């Protein structure tokens, strides 16, 4: 059991960790996405000639637009990985746990978190890509052959209700603590030292979506709740990878994403 | 929004309610299975199982045994639907929300309590059948041959988790309520009685579970994260019916029995 001032406390330090390791904030993208800014409006990918057009005017070859636009997600993930570990280091408590499960947590929490912070990139119409610099309409990514067509709808699902609930960023810097610092992943040797961390988390949140949401009934709840939809997208997403895999055999992952979906 | 008074309420209505449902409660079954009492009849091996159907008579019970296991299953599953349904009557606004969600409602919610409820009557050693005279250990269950020694076990793993939170039945009456009126049941036609009714009941539980439970921090969170086990062992679930259906045809019964069980 946490005091108030401490917990706002850690509230303010993860706040502030997440806008040192995260380049693009909710914040941004919606003001990006809203528009009412001429020097913020970014190019629209829709069809097959404005893509062409978009590395032209975006910048960041011989291969097939639907693979092109998936190898760009396995990288702009990659970075998301990078970005998402250095994030977790600065969760006091977290640098200090055994490593075998620091890498545990992250191999799990890694997607769950991805596809979280993607909902502040996307409406229902499409997502924010390049740094903000793109969008690339939702319709357009439903038109891709093969199995890459179905890639992304899962994930506009997700944040079409994710996004009603109206987070701002200090409220999802609390919550992706929370889902790093679970204690179920399979796997993990010190349950304990992790579930006390994930105490404080919990505690933290649930302050901080009383005071900056204080008419919002129950969001801590709700909030909660919309945990069950991320792993479903994570498996969801796990199974397509696999269909790839056995189907192009031309294409090729990452290392530090070949590691996180082994098992 | 609600006044404490209100939820305190609330919870004794849905607490009394639950008993009037459920015949073997939590309490009741927590006495048998820790020694807290006529012993139940324990089934452990092939021997014991067929002795048990003759002196107590089991209903689900009564082919091949790993299957006839398997159809027992199904059959108490299938009373359980009718308890739990009878229970929702009883929460408040439950029955004046349209009827066709009230039906979609509990068709993707009964699952869930199911599980819930079934970890009440599990220990890490076995289960209580029968309303509570018998005990099939979980070594004779993960024994059985095929698919249907994986089938068991992920509700063993589940409940001993699960069990771990030392929730009580005042706990679980006003958690089982809050699973069925969950607005994002696919084809619901007015989600908003259904949250609003949820909202209630998730004040209800979280009062109930601090001053029931004071020295368990943020054991609220924890039971709120359960449902994210809950949701991936229904899921898990219905993948083993859709193996079973497909590979063994040892399993069709009367087509009359075929429709009850559907
Ligand atoms: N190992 C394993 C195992 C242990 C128990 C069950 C039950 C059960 C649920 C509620 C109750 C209760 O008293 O409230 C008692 C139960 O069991 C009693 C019993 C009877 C005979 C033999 C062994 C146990 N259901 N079930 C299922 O398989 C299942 C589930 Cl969870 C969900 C949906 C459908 C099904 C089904 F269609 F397939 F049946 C169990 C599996």
Known sequence: HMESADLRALAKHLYDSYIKSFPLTKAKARAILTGKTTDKSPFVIYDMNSLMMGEDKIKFQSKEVAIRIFQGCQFRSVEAVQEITEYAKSIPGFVNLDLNDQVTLLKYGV????????????????????????????????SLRKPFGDFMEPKFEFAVKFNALELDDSDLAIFIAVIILSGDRPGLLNVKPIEDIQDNLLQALELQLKL?????????????????????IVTEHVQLLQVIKKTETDMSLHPLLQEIYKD
């Open 212 to 232: 900056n949401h204080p008419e919002s009934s129950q969001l801590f709840a709700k909030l909660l709740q919309k945990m069950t939809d991320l792993r479903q």
């Open 111 to 142: 997607h769950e978190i991805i596809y979280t912070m993607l909902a502040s990139l996307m409406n229902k119409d499409g997502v924010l890509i390049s740094e903000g610099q793109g969008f690339m309409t939702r319709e357009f990514l439903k």
